[PDB]
Design an enzyme around this catalytic site. Structure first.
Site, mmCIF file in Angstrom:
data_model
loop_
_atom_site.group_PDB
_atom_site.id
_atom_site.type_symbol
_atom_site.label_atom_id
_atom_site.label_comp_id
_atom_site.label_asym_id
_atom_site.label_seq_id
_atom_site.Cartn_x
_atom_site.Cartn_y
_atom_site.Cartn_z
ATOM 1 N N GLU B 290 0.866 -1.173 0.000
ATOM 2 C CA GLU B 290 0.000 0.000 0.000
ATOM 3 C C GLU B 290 0.903 1.223 0.000
ATOM 4 O O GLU B 290 1.562 1.525 1.002
ATOM 5 C CB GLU B 290 -0.930 -0.022 1.208
ATOM 6 N N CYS B 324 -0.888 8.998 1.955
ATOM 7 C CA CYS B 324 -0.697 8.404 0.633
ATOM 8 C C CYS B 324 -1.689 8.975 -0.361
ATOM 9 O O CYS B 324 -1.460 8.946 -1.580
ATOM 10 C CB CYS B 324 -0.842 6.882 0.697
#
Ligand SMILES: [Mg+2]
EC number: 1.2.1.88
Lengths: 522, 505
Positions: B290, B324
């Site tokens: 991820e 992110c």
């Protein structure tokens, strides 16, 4: 506001009996007569274009290698690159086509194979790959047809799995195809069309370069032509037979590779994986890898087992289609006490097994093995059984390649549970037997697991329920498809679905989509 | 015959307001004081053994780096090997435990984090990782509590299959054979509860190498998991040097998976390492990563300015841009720019950077560590000196007390400029102004310059433009937002291998 959506329900494809005098048997006789003495010139296909290279190859009929059933050619680097460019240019529109519409194509194809083209597909797998009628039929219905319908169902239903919108937001999930092209790969001498290898990714909005197996070229092209006739647009599946290493090098070198859907050996899959890693920095997206490989499959027998279930299940698993199934049994573990009865029946029943021309004789149990390379490998194994001090051939043992690649079903006892013949895949009609001491069954269960390298399927025969529970735990990672009192090749979702198709499995169809979450605020 | 099925109804964890006078604020104020001037000693944990090595390390407060908040240590090769062996010996029984039993531990842990441990986890992430109160709260509720609860539900339901009757048939969802490594980089911002937790829930055993910069909070979650009934040797708590750990687990014949969160290049490194080592493994390792991206907001001329302005500043600057999913590039039409520019600068001037523990008015605090501070500082000097770039607001930084960086807005005259393309993971927003009648060309430009397409947003009142933008940017973002910010407002399947069992009766 409102939107029209679709839902889809599907039944399994029935498996036809072909009874002496039945109608499907009539049409199959006609299809088989159609192939006798006949060859098809099969081109590579890029878009709607038929392309020939000078690297010409031939598929022969395994039980009559004098009969060239197909002439084709290996794509070269240049052709493969053009196939890639053309697929990429077609991808976005295909991806954007509604899933219901893509599904309809595969449902049409399924229906064509189910009815009008059933005889054709069966005859081409029989003549081109050496399948018996029952083997060809089982595979046509449970594998090829069922996968087209059940994939389509899964895809349409997936589409209907939508987030509840909690205002002031409208949420939805879009199931995108992967960005790039998918390479669908089966070995040059593989015993299966592997239609799902190209079919599953295509259905999910991907574009595919399909390198079919040389030894299944006839039937593979028959499926391709049917998909196209069913309305598969150009450049969605590129039909590109090719040298195995050349194809591998080319697709893993492409910046546009988004996936590899592979069936074949563990070493080959490992090689491809390494190549993808080597080129990792060059890809526009992270390639997804799907590999179906293995294994040296087993039947374990407890002394409480039904002897006839053991014998019947084991002969059939080991020798159907010449043991050329990923799921075939090639090792049998039997307790010392039951061995004389089992050994006796095995040998008696071995004598009933008819090996011959499957087109000429529907009584045929199995036919010649797939090609010269495999005939050679298997013959070396027969020689090994006849020479190794640990090994005794109990039945069969002979081979003859004068008319076809013919190998008698072979049963071999090993005194050594660690013998190479117990651990290495032969992919041929060679069953190894280890007789273990009755007081050492628990230890032997552990032995089955510890000598399992890439275990696909397995079975335990036992009337004792306690023993079954024990074996189920000990052998938990010794087989993905595990059977209790039945054969490792299975018996008669998609009827041929198993571990590989379940959620978490390598071939789970969801792997060919990347879900996008869209959230709108009002 | 007939059977009971089993399911789990789960509601989202509410996000608390922390208003003055509220019990949760009272509790948090208390937990924050307890951390003041205190240093927890955090050992490696292998089974039930707390183990110290001589490789002692310290976690400091990002906004006050003279404040050591934890002392811990790095596992060496010998300890990692011992952790692998002990986890492997415990795996078969854990794998065999019913999923309901495993899920219950994670449900208890989520409930603990929800109630009596909530103030603790919030305080530890604030002081340790530099999060504001609401950022810490959103993350605890979402990345920790909801993940535990909902994963448990998915796992439990996974065994909710059709009844088969005598020729019976079922699917057993096996944990992977081997151990799973849960890895996040030494200066990453994640707690890592779901990194170690998801594979464990699915019957795997895990060596967890948490982020040094989140050690205090990570150990707090570990302890809660054990208190909730996680047996020994299921998750080994093994902080370690990144490279040593990566080299050790990838050299082990027993590795069956890597669950990673961090930068793409680090993930690619591990991916390559597993592939180079493929021949040794007893099973094909599965990798999950991820990672962050260079996320965008695309504005059409019909957009609502205030939405564009508020959404962009929040996405760009919450948690210092250390998400992110954070917006780092803004595309604006020429006609809207004067209005958008003016509002961006007015709102920018109201952004308070400071101590999140001492001042709840803080918008965002210091960035996570010195390496991050240095990286950010180099981009600021690049923005200052490059001919193609103009710093519109901010641009300063100071590491004398904490790793403090002003939120920075930069305009680029070039859409292909490095600052438009490279992930900074910090409070630096880059803006490109495009001609109104080239919005079509610019949409394609957003996509063509997208290397990792994590999140994105389109701001438009024109519905026809919305539909258009969604097609063009279909592969430019996995989470796509319409008139909302890029940070927002069946994964567990990787950790299971289904076995089909069929019995003939
Ligand atoms: Mg299959």
């Amino acid at each position: 506001r409102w939107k029209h959506t679709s839902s889809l329900k599907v039944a399994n494809e029935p498996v036809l009996a072909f009874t002496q005098g039945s109608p499907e048997r009539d049409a199959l006789q006609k299809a088989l007569k159609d192939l006798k003495g006949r060859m098809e010139a099969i081109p590579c296909v890029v878009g709607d274009e038929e392309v020939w290279t000078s690297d010409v190859q031939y598929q022969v009929s395994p039980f009559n290698h004098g009969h060239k059933v197909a002439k084709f050619c290996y794509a070269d680097k240049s052709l493969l690159n053009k196939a890639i460019e053309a697929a990429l240019a077609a991808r976005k529109e295909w991806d954007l086509k509604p899933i219901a519409d893509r599904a309809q194509i595969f449902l049409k194809a399924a229906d064509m194979l189910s009815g009008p083209r059933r005889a054709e597909i069966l005859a081409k797998t029989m003549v081109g790959q050496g399948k018996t009628v029952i083997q060809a039929e089982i595979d046509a219905a449970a594998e090829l047809i069922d996968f087209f319908r059940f994939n389509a169902k899964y895809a349409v239903e997936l589409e209907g799995q939508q987030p509840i919108s909690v205002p002031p937001s409208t949420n939805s999930t879009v199931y995108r195809g992967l960005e790039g092209f998918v390479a669908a790969i089966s070995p040059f001498n593989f015993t299966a069309i592997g239609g799902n290898l190209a079919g599953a990714p295509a259905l999910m909005g991907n574009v595919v370069l399909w390198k079919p197996s040389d030894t299944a070229m006839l039937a593979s092209y028959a499926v391709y032509r049917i998909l196209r006739e069913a309305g598969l647009p150009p450049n969605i599946i590129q039909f590109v037979p090719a040298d195995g290493p050349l194809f591998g090098d080319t697709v893993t070198s492409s910046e546009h590779l988004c996936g590899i859907n592979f069936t074949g050996s563990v070493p080959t899959f490992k090689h491809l994986w390494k190549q993808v890693a080597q080129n990792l920095d060059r890809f526009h997206t992270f390639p997804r890898l799907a590999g179906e490989c293995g294994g040296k499959n087993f039947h374990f027998v407890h002394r409480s087992a039904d002897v006839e279930s053991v014998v019947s299940g084991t002969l059939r698993s080991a020798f159907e289609y010449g043991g050329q199934k990923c799921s075939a049994c090639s090792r049998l573990y039997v307790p010392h006490s039951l061995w004389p009865q089992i050994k006796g029946r095995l040998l008696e029943e071995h004598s009933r097994i008819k090996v011959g021309d499957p087109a000429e004789d529907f009584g045929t149990f199995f036919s010649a093995v797939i090609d010269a390379k495999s005939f050679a490998r298997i013959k070396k194994w027969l020689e090994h059984a006849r020479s190794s001090p640990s090994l005794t051939i109990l039945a069969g043992g002979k081979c003859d390649d004068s008319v076809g690649y013919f190998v008698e079903p072979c049963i071999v006892e090993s005194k050594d549970p660690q013998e190479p013949i117990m651990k290495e895949e032969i992919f041929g009609p060679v069953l190894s037997v280890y007789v273990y001491p009755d007081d050492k069954y628990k230890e032997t269960l552990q032995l089955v697991d510890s000598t399992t390298s890439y275990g696909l399927t397995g079975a335990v025969f036992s009337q004792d329920k306690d023993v079954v529970q024990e074996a189920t735990k000990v052998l938990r990672n010794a087989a993905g498809n595990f059977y209790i009192n039945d054969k490792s090749t299975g018996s008669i979702g998609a009827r041929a679905s198993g571990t590989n198709d379940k959620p978490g499995g390598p071939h789970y169809i969801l792997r060919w989509t990347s879900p996008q979450v869209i959230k709108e605020t009002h």
